[PDB]
Design an enzyme around this catalytic site. Structure first.
Site, PDB file in Angstrom:
ATOM      1  N   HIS A 112       2.194   4.194   2.446  1.00  0.00           N
ATOM      2  CA  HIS A 112       1.165   4.250   1.422  1.00  0.00           C
ATOM      3  C   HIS A 112      -0.169   4.783   1.927  1.00  0.00           C
ATOM      4  O   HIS A 112      -1.004   5.138   1.092  1.00  0.00           O
ATOM      5  CB  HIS A 112       1.000   2.912   0.692  1.00  0.00           C
ATOM      6  CG  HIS A 112       0.330   1.836   1.492  1.00  0.00           C
ATOM      7  ND1 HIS A 112       1.027   0.923   2.247  1.00  0.00           N
ATOM      8  CD2 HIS A 112      -0.971   1.464   1.565  1.00  0.00           C
ATOM      9  CE1 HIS A 112       0.180   0.068   2.800  1.00  0.00           C
ATOM     10  NE2 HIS A 112      -1.038   0.368   2.393  1.00  0.00           N
TER      11      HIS A 112
ATOM     12  N   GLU B  70       8.246   1.623   3.166  1.00  0.00           N
ATOM     13  CA  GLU B  70       6.864   1.662   3.636  1.00  0.00           C
ATOM     14  C   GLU B  70       6.738   2.016   5.115  1.00  0.00           C
ATOM     15  O   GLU B  70       5.630   2.028   5.615  1.00  0.00           O
ATOM     16  CB  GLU B  70       6.031   0.425   3.259  1.00  0.00           C
ATOM     17  CG  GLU B  70       5.621   0.470   1.794  1.00  0.00           C
ATOM     18  CD  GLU B  70       4.698   1.649   1.527  1.00  0.00           C
ATOM     19  OE1 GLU B  70       4.962   2.451   0.606  1.00  0.00           O
ATOM     20  OE2 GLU B  70       3.690   1.772   2.256  1.00  0.00           O
TER      21      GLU B  70
ATOM     22  N   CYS C  67      -4.417  -0.381   6.864  1.00  0.00           N
ATOM     23  CA  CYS C  67      -2.983  -0.415   7.162  1.00  0.00           C
ATOM     24  C   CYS C  67      -2.568   0.691   8.135  1.00  0.00           C
ATOM     25  O   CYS C  67      -3.283   1.671   8.356  1.00  0.00           O
ATOM     26  CB  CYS C  67      -2.157  -0.286   5.868  1.00  0.00           C
ATOM     27  SG  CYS C  67      -1.954  -1.821   5.007  1.00  0.00           S
TER      28      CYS C  67
HETATM   29  C1  LIG Z   1      -3.351  -1.868   3.848  1.00  0.00           C
HETATM   30  O1  LIG Z   1      -3.321  -0.863   2.982  1.00  0.00           O
HETATM   31  C2  LIG Z   1      -3.479  -3.270   3.273  1.00  0.00           C
HETATM   32  C3  LIG Z   1      -3.630  -4.318   4.346  1.00  0.00           C
HETATM   33  C4  LIG Z   1      -4.156  -5.623   3.737  1.00  0.00           C
HETATM   34  C5  LIG Z   1      -4.772  -6.459   4.826  1.00  0.00           C
HETATM   35  O2  LIG Z   1      -4.226  -6.676   5.864  1.00  0.00           O
HETATM   36  N1  LIG Z   1      -6.078  -6.984   4.564  1.00  0.00           N
HETATM   37  C6  LIG Z   1      -6.765  -7.846   5.555  1.00  0.00           C
HETATM   38  C7  LIG Z   1      -6.547  -9.372   5.094  1.00  0.00           C
HETATM   39  C8  LIG Z   1      -7.233  -9.654   3.756  1.00  0.00           C
HETATM   40  C9  LIG Z   1      -6.542 -10.875   2.965  1.00  0.00           C
HETATM   41  C10 LIG Z   1      -5.340 -10.401   2.188  1.00  0.00           C
HETATM   42  C11 LIG Z   1      -5.760  -9.473   1.057  1.00  0.00           C
HETATM   43  N2  LIG Z   1      -4.646  -9.310   0.133  1.00  0.00           N
HETATM   44  C12 LIG Z   1      -3.988  -8.167  -0.253  1.00  0.00           C
HETATM   45  C13 LIG Z   1      -2.943  -8.472  -1.192  1.00  0.00           C
HETATM   46  N3  LIG Z   1      -3.047  -9.806  -1.302  1.00  0.00           N
HETATM   47  N4  LIG Z   1      -4.032 -10.275  -0.532  1.00  0.00           N
HETATM   48  C14 LIG Z   1      -1.916  -7.534  -1.924  1.00  0.00           C
HETATM   49  C15 LIG Z   1      -0.649  -7.405  -1.093  1.00  0.00           C
HETATM   50  N5  LIG Z   1      -0.249  -8.679  -0.475  1.00  0.00           N
HETATM   51  C16 LIG Z   1       0.945  -9.393  -0.988  1.00  0.00           C
HETATM   52  O3  LIG Z   1       1.384  -9.085  -2.047  1.00  0.00           O
HETATM   53  O4  LIG Z   1       1.503 -10.408  -0.178  1.00  0.00           O
HETATM   54  C17 LIG Z   1       2.610 -11.123  -0.702  1.00  0.00           C
HETATM   55  C18 LIG Z   1       3.731 -11.158   0.374  1.00  0.00           C
HETATM   56  C19 LIG Z   1       3.521 -11.836   1.609  1.00  0.00           C
HETATM   57  C20 LIG Z   1       4.537 -11.871   2.571  1.00  0.00           C
HETATM   58  C21 LIG Z   1       5.772 -11.235   2.318  1.00  0.00           C
HETATM   59  C22 LIG Z   1       5.986 -10.559   1.084  1.00  0.00           C
HETATM   60  C23 LIG Z   1       4.970 -10.526   0.121  1.00  0.00           C
HETATM   61  C24 LIG Z   1      -0.863  -6.402   0.013  1.00  0.00           C
HETATM   62  O5  LIG Z   1      -1.076  -6.653   1.166  1.00  0.00           O
HETATM   63  N6  LIG Z   1      -0.789  -5.036  -0.458  1.00  0.00           N
HETATM   64  C25 LIG Z   1      -0.933  -3.966   0.520  1.00  0.00           C
HETATM   65  C26 LIG Z   1      -0.698  -2.593  -0.152  1.00  0.00           C
HETATM   66  C27 LIG Z   1       0.775  -2.379  -0.676  1.00  0.00           C
HETATM   67  C28 LIG Z   1       0.858  -0.952  -1.257  1.00  0.00           C
HETATM   68  C29 LIG Z   1       2.279  -0.585  -1.697  1.00  0.00           C
HETATM   69  C30 LIG Z   1       3.265  -0.754  -0.563  1.00  0.00           C
HETATM   70  C31 LIG Z   1       3.200  -2.191  -0.024  1.00  0.00           C
HETATM   71  C32 LIG Z   1       1.786  -2.570   0.433  1.00  0.00           C
HETATM   72  C33 LIG Z   1      -2.283  -3.928   1.107  1.00  0.00           C
HETATM   73  O6  LIG Z   1      -3.266  -4.187   0.569  1.00  0.00           O
HETATM   74  N7  LIG Z   1      -2.255  -3.473   2.502  1.00  0.00           N
END
Ligand SMILES: *[C@@H](O)[C@@H]1CCC(=O)NCCCCCCn2cc(nn2)C[C@H](NC(=O)OCc2ccccc2)C(=O)N[C@@H](CC2CCCCC2)C(=O)N1
Ligand SMILES: [Cl-]
Ligand SMILES: [Cl-]
Ligand SMILES: [Cl-]
Length: 174
Positions: free
Chosen positions: A31, A55, A140
């Site tokens: 992404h 990803e 990321c």
């Molecule tokens: C990079 O593009 C980011 C990295 C996020 C990161 O590391 N931030 C630093 C910490 C801040 C606190 C967390 C912020 N936060 C983001 C989300 N929720 N909280 C949205 C997504 N998280 C999620 O859904 O977690 C649920 C989960 C946990 C464990 C196992 C399964 C599911 C999230 O991180 N989304 C990322 C982008 C998506 C885009 C499409 C492909 C998958 C990742 C994101 O924001 N990454």
């Protein structure tokens, strides 16, 4: 305890970061890859073998892009319980290794995208006080590495996190 040569592999890319596994192989999280481009690192798309899923993106270039580097081992995730270091770099060049205790490899849907990843929990006892999800940069693509014997191995790229359970996810190659 990652050496400077290991950190020199961590490279700004797209909206995040990626990592040189070898002179010809670069890995990142899908992404963060830029779209609508005709080249990556100056090389035409026709000269790059792309292998991506869940990803995890790998680029294999047709020439030595980083001839300064030795090839290291890229593993398809790591054993449960491995302590990895996420090699976070700041824009200034400051190095912020983030220790994480790894859990299981699984398929997950995160924000409507299938992710083939490994979850982990930040290892508070191995990070500076206050260096946690509420204070790290939110980018990321940073690599998850760990030591096999004396040698560093890379096993994933940073893809997601949640404050719930202090949990991170790296995408892993299939
Ligand atoms: C990079 O593009 C980011 C990295 C996020 C990161 O590391 N931030 C630093 C910490 C801040 C606190 C967390 C912020 N936060 C983001 C989300 N929720 N909280 C949205 C997504 N998280 C999620 O859904 O977690 C649920 C989960 C946990 C464990 C196992 C399964 C599911 C999230 O991180 N989304 C990322 C982008 C998506 C885009 C499409 C492909 C998958 C990742 C994101 O924001 N990454
Ligand atoms: Cl190295
Ligand atoms: Cl770029
Ligand atoms: Cl894909």
């Amino acid at each position: 305890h990652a050496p400077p040569t290991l950190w020199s592999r961590v490279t700004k890319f797209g909206s995040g970061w990626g990592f040189w596994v070898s002179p010809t192989v670069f890995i990142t999280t899908t992404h963060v890859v830029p779209t609508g481009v005709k080249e990556f690192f100056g090389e035409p798309l026709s000269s790059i073998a792309i292998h991506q899923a869940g990803e995890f993106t790998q680029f294999r270039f047709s020439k030595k892009m980083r001839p300064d580097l030795t090839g290291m081992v890229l593993e398809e995730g790591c054993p449960e319980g491995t302590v990895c270091s996420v090699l976070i770099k700041r824009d200034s060049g400051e190095l912020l290794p983030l220790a994480v205790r790894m859990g299981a490899i699984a398929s997950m849907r995160i924000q409507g995208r299938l992710v083939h990843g490994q979850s982990g929990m930040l290892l508070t006892g191995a990070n500076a006080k206050g260096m946690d999800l509420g204070t790290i940069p939110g980018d990321c693509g940073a690599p998850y590495v760990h030591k096999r014997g004396n040698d560093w191995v890379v096993c994933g790229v940073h893809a997601a996190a949640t404050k719930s359970g202090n949990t991170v996810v790296c995408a892993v190659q299939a």
